[PDB]
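assembly run, all chains below
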Amino acid sequence: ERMQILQNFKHNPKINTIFISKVGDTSFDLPEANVLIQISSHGGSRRQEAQRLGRVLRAKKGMVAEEYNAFFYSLVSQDTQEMAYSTKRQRFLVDQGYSFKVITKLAGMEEEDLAFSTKEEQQQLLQKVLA
Amino acid sequence: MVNVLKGVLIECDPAMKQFLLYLDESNALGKKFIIQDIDDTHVFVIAELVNVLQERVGELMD
Amino acid sequence: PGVLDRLYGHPATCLAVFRELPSLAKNWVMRMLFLKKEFSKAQEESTGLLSGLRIWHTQLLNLRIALLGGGKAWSDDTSQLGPDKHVLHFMVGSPSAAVSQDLAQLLSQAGLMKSTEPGEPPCITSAGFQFLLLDTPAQLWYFMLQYLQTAQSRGMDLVEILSFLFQLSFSTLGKDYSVEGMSDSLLNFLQHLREFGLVFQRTDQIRLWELERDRLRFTEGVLYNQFLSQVDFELLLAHARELGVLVFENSAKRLMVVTPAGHSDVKRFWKRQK
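ok done. output:
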């Protein structure tokens, strides 16, 4: 089932997003892509984020010699212990030569359908998570 | 209707942090003085003098 | 040559027409400058006349030598005119004009030493209230006055000039306020003062805009209103806060509302009358 999902992700133009756990690190042939999102700051190593980025991401066609043609994202919840990892992460990646920025707002998230459209929906998840 | 007036500070926090302040209010020492009442989910009538403490404590706390 | 009076006359006319209220004159006065000028000018209305007065000395910069001397001759007339005339705009005009005459080096140091105009520049310089715009012309005048003296051997003025010393309190203020423009002007005064009389006298930053934002965080200083006798008195007292723009919140089902401290008093007054 992994080799079916990964063959589909690499060749099939219908299968363009996949989700993966810690098993990619340490002896694993992660596939090629052009976009990497980490849902959390974790506790695996700032240096493993850069190994994982480096082994997964490549240039999108046509644009193969431009300022950027691949994208990495790390998502952080404000006002939590998740924020502490940033001043280290930021210093590490820029010392590794990477262009790195902080995005602090998305006012176009207020222009389309997305999940958690109400307090009641958010409450439904809050009860499940608390248990 | 100008029956009663009360100088207080109106805090317009988010639906996330407000309950945190409430938690600050209880389970605390020398506290519980802090919140006058919860007018809205977003807004609370609180403190005065406590505001400095509430903000600072929130800062120190995660 | 018959043309000369006519052409320049038309601009004299234009300046005359929109002479009174604003600051139209400056551009036109300059044109006028090139083409007993001072004696004749004196009759004309003060504003604009001063403008012409200001720019003409500047414009000078053989026959030129003759011009300067000629100007020197009626430096007194302008000086008499300068005082007596003495808004911020006018004030700017009087010192700008004086400053300009000073760089020309036509003005008599004596005479200047004992005159109201010198008191007036340090007066505005002293007062906190004066705006940045008045300040810069006042400052410039002082600088130019000192500049004018290239001697001090014979210059009574470089005594009154000492009036700069009074300014330090003003610089302390100004510093207290974040008025960089008011401080820089002071430094120019000091530096110029020393100059004349010197002989005589013995990424990373991303966390720094975040650390700035950590110093701003919200709440408001506020009066709450409750236990209102009937709905009409909530709605009157509420509408009369909303037109005052100092409603932070309202809930008509509570009969309860909030005003920030700056309109507590307009609400306390409306609650007493109606």
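The interface with chain C takes residues 87, 90, 94, 102 of chain A (CB under 8 Å).

The first strand of chain A starts at residue 35 and ends at 38.

not gonna interpret more than that til we talk
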